[PDB]
Amino acid sequence: SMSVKKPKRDDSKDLALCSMILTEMETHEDAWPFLLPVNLKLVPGYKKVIKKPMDFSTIREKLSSGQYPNLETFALDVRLVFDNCETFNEDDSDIGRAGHNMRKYFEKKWTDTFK
Numbered sequence: 001s002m003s004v005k006k007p008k009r010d011d012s013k014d015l016a017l018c019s020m021i022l023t024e025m026e027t028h029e030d031a032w033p034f035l036l037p038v039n040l041k042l043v044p045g046y047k048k049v050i051k052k053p054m055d056f057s058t059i060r061e062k063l064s065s066g067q068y069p070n071l072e073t074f075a076l077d078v079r080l081v082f083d084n085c086e087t088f089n090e091d092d093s094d095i096g097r098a099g100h101n102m103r104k105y106f107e108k109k110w111t112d113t114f115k
C-alpha cells in the first residue's frame, strides 16, 4: 500500500524469455492447429462460439509491438489458445490431443523459466 512496497522482483529479462518460449512453441510439431487465426468466414460455429480467438501469430505480433504489460498477460493469451481448443474439439481428436500436448509443453517451460 502507499509507501509500503514489497521487494522488487527482477522483470528486466521477461520480454526476451517470453519470446524464447513462444519460438519454442512455434516450432513444436504439434503447433500446426495454432499457428494462424482460425478463418471465421469458413469454419462453422467458431465466430459465434469462441468469444476471444487467439493464436500464436497474434501473440507474436502483440509481443513484438509492446502490447503485453507483463508476463502474466502473456501467459493468459497462451492459455487462451488451449482453452479455446478444448471448447471447440473433442479430447479424442488429433487437434484435441495437440492442444493437451502443447499446454503441457508450455506449462513446463513456464515453471522452469520463471518459478
Ligand SMILES: O=C(O)c1cccc(O)n1
Pocket (backbone or CB within 6 Å): 038, 043, 085, 088, 089, 095
Ligand atoms: O476442423 C476442426 O476440427 C477445427 C477447425 C478449426 C478450428 C478447430 O479448433 N478445429
